Design an enzyme around this catalytic site. Structure first.
Site, PDB file in Angstrom:
ATOM      1  N   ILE A 157      89.301  60.459  50.588  1.00  0.00           N
ATOM      2  CA  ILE A 157      88.754  60.887  51.901  1.00  0.00           C
ATOM      3  C   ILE A 157      89.723  60.680  53.039  1.00  0.00           C
ATOM      4  O   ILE A 157      89.441  61.120  54.173  1.00  0.00           O
ATOM      5  CB  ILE A 157      87.412  60.190  52.224  1.00  0.00           C
ATOM      6  N   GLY A 158      90.844  60.039  52.796  1.00  0.00           N
ATOM      7  CA  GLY A 158      91.843  59.914  53.846  1.00  0.00           C
ATOM      8  C   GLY A 158      93.221  59.808  53.239  1.00  0.00           C
ATOM      9  O   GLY A 158      93.416  59.102  52.231  1.00  0.00           O
ATOM     10  N   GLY A 159      94.138  60.589  53.778  1.00  0.00           N
ATOM     11  CA  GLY A 159      95.564  60.528  53.535  1.00  0.00           C
ATOM     12  C   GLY A 159      96.271  60.661  54.879  1.00  0.00           C
ATOM     13  O   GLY A 159      95.624  60.578  55.935  1.00  0.00           O
ATOM     14  N   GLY A 160      97.586  60.818  54.855  1.00  0.00           N
ATOM     15  CA  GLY A 160      98.349  60.842  56.095  1.00  0.00           C
ATOM     16  C   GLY A 160      98.179  59.559  56.891  1.00  0.00           C
ATOM     17  O   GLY A 160      98.389  58.446  56.385  1.00  0.00           O
ATOM     18  N   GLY A 161      97.777  59.711  58.160  1.00  0.00           N
ATOM     19  CA  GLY A 161      97.642  58.550  59.021  1.00  0.00           C
ATOM     20  C   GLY A 161      96.468  57.670  58.675  1.00  0.00           C
ATOM     21  O   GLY A 161      96.424  56.511  59.109  1.00  0.00           O
ATOM     22  N   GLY A 176      95.993  56.636  55.742  1.00  0.00           N
ATOM     23  CA  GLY A 176      96.407  55.843  54.590  1.00  0.00           C
ATOM     24  C   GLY A 176      95.682  56.305  53.338  1.00  0.00           C
ATOM     25  O   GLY A 176      95.060  57.376  53.305  1.00  0.00           O
ATOM     26  N   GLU A 177      95.577  55.420  52.381  1.00  0.00           N
ATOM     27  CA  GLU A 177      94.993  55.833  51.113  1.00  0.00           C
ATOM     28  C   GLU A 177      93.586  55.238  51.054  1.00  0.00           C
ATOM     29  O   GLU A 177      93.414  54.047  50.752  1.00  0.00           O
ATOM     30  CB  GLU A 177      95.901  55.361  49.986  1.00  0.00           C
ATOM     31  N   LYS A 220      89.852  51.192  50.689  1.00  0.00           N
ATOM     32  CA  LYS A 220      91.182  51.495  51.197  1.00  0.00           C
ATOM     33  C   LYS A 220      92.201  50.626  50.482  1.00  0.00           C
ATOM     34  O   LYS A 220      91.936  49.444  50.208  1.00  0.00           O
ATOM     35  CB  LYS A 220      91.233  51.297  52.727  1.00  0.00           C
ATOM     36  N   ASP A 276      94.627  51.834  68.615  1.00  0.00           N
ATOM     37  CA  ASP A 276      94.716  53.240  68.187  1.00  0.00           C
ATOM     38  C   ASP A 276      93.352  53.904  68.346  1.00  0.00           C
ATOM     39  O   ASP A 276      92.806  54.556  67.441  1.00  0.00           O
ATOM     40  CB  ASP A 276      95.267  53.323  66.756  1.00  0.00           C
TER      41      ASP A 276
HETATM   42  C1  LIG Z   1      83.985  60.345  55.482  1.00  0.00           C
HETATM   43  O1  LIG Z   1      85.320  59.937  55.929  1.00  0.00           O
HETATM   44  C2  LIG Z   1      85.595  58.575  56.206  1.00  0.00           C
HETATM   45  C3  LIG Z   1      84.523  57.654  56.038  1.00  0.00           C
HETATM   46  C4  LIG Z   1      84.765  56.253  56.294  1.00  0.00           C
HETATM   47  N1  LIG Z   1      83.817  55.261  56.166  1.00  0.00           N
HETATM   48  C5  LIG Z   1      84.155  53.944  56.411  1.00  0.00           C
HETATM   49  N2  LIG Z   1      85.439  53.602  56.814  1.00  0.00           N
HETATM   50  C6  LIG Z   1      86.304  54.632  56.983  1.00  0.00           C
HETATM   51  N3  LIG Z   1      87.522  54.004  57.432  1.00  0.00           N
HETATM   52  C7  LIG Z   1      87.954  52.648  57.789  1.00  0.00           C
HETATM   53  C8  LIG Z   1      87.066  51.653  58.208  1.00  0.00           C
HETATM   54  C9  LIG Z   1      87.586  50.371  58.470  1.00  0.00           C
HETATM   55  C10 LIG Z   1      88.915  50.143  58.260  1.00  0.00           C
HETATM   56  C11 LIG Z   1      89.776  51.161  57.814  1.00  0.00           C
HETATM   57  O2  LIG Z   1      91.103  50.854  57.655  1.00  0.00           O
HETATM   58  C12 LIG Z   1      89.279  52.433  57.544  1.00  0.00           C
HETATM   59  C13 LIG Z   1      86.016  55.928  56.710  1.00  0.00           C
HETATM   60  C14 LIG Z   1      87.114  56.858  56.868  1.00  0.00           C
HETATM   61  C15 LIG Z   1      86.832  58.186  56.600  1.00  0.00           C
HETATM   62  O3  LIG Z   1      87.731  59.260  56.689  1.00  0.00           O
HETATM   63  C16 LIG Z   1      89.097  58.874  56.822  1.00  0.00           C
END
Ligand SMILES: COc1cc2ncnc(Nc3cccc(O)c3)c2cc1OC
Length: 292
Positions: A20-24, A26-27, A43, A134
């Site tokens: 659900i997340g890449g790029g900025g 992270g993983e 994460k 940020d």
């Molecule tokens: C549905 O998409 C997302 C759902 C998310 N739900 C919880 N945390 C996220 N991120 C988070 C919370 C606390 C610390 C941290 O480093 C990252 C999320 C990020 C998402 O997308 C990137």
């Protein structure tokens, strides 16, 4: 390169399901928590990476547990290959929600209610001694269930910094601090490589609120960090009051008066939201723009 892949089981408990997340971002993944039978966020970062920040994200998440607008902490670990953190999974982020508005703007009613919630989350992180550094729309998301979808949650502590010392006094600032955050929302102090303070998170909030209502910031097309900073340094920010409710002149004058060593008057900033919501007749039950 990613360290995990979909299908991996972490600690014989969290099954990684979907990136659900890449790029900025992270993983970060949607994972299945086999203990509670629910989707969670997970994460990861490599344990051999030079700058590893999840240790601090875990500390911030734990220090915020019990605050509104924060994801519940679920777990963490560290091994020879990677570090990870597990926390409550949220829904669509505000950058995604705004861009999915087709005119790419929010109404004043949605903007005021989101902005008040974000201000609450900012006062909260400052109250435990950390700056977010940020603050930007993709780092805030709405909940994913009926009971949480009207609540806005602060995400991503990877760029946070503790600004108080052992005692709880403000720590002496560094003479020079490398630029932290996203160019578009950064305060002039980040551009000047000064130690960031509580007011710099609030500057980023002000830019977010302006972008919500207008659809863009004046430096939208400028990518060079130095060119953007030169614009912000000279910019008459009172031009941004044109499309905001009148009491945001008080908000802008207040944050413009602050420096690293001055605690923001959060109560004053909150009253700007409360008074505006009342003047415009906004009710909490009213639909958000994406609920129309
Ligand atoms: C549905 O998409 C997302 C759902 C998310 N739900 C919880 N945390 C996220 N991120 C988070 C919370 C606390 C610390 C941290 O480093 C990252 C999320 C990020 C998402 O997308 C990137």
């Amino acid at each position: 390169l990613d360290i995990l892949s979909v299908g991996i089981l972490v600690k014989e408990r969290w099954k990684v399901l979907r990136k659900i997340g890449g790029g900025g971002f992270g993983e970060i993944y949607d994972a299945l928590d086999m203990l509670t039978r629910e989707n969670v966020a997970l994460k990861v970062e490599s344990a051999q990476q030079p700058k590893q920040v999840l240790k601090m994200e875990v500390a911030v998440l734990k220090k915020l547990q019990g605050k509104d607008h924060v994801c519940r902490f679920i777990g963490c670990g560290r091994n020879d290959r990677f570090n990870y953190v597990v926390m409550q999974l949220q829904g669509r982020n505000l950058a995604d929600l705004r861009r999915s508005q087709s005119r790419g703007t929010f109404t004043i009613s949605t903007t005021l209610r989101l902005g008040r919630q974000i201000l609450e989350s900012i006062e909260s992180i400052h109250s435990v001694g950390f700056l977010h550094r940020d603050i930007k729309p993709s780092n805030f998301a709405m909940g994913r269930f009926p009971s949480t979808c009207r609540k806005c949650y602060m995400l991503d502590f990877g760029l946070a910094r503790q600004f108080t010392n052992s005692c709880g006094d403000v720590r002496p600032p560094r003479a020079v601090a490398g630029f932290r955050g996203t160019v578009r929302y950064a305060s002039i102090n980040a551009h000047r490589n000064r130690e960031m303070g509580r007011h710099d998170d609030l500057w980023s909030l002000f830019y977010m609120l302006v972008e919500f209502v207008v659809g863009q910031l004046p430096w939208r097309k400028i990518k060079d960090k130095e060119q953007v900073g030169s614009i912000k340094e000279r910019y008459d920010h009172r031009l941004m009051l044109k499309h905001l409710p009148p009491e945001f002149s008080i908000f802008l004058d207040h944050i413009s008066s602050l420096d690293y060593f001055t605690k923001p008057d959060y109560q004053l900033l909150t009253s700007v939201f409360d008074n505006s919501i009342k003047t415009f007749g906004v009710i909490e039950s009213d639909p958000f723009d994406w609920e129309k």
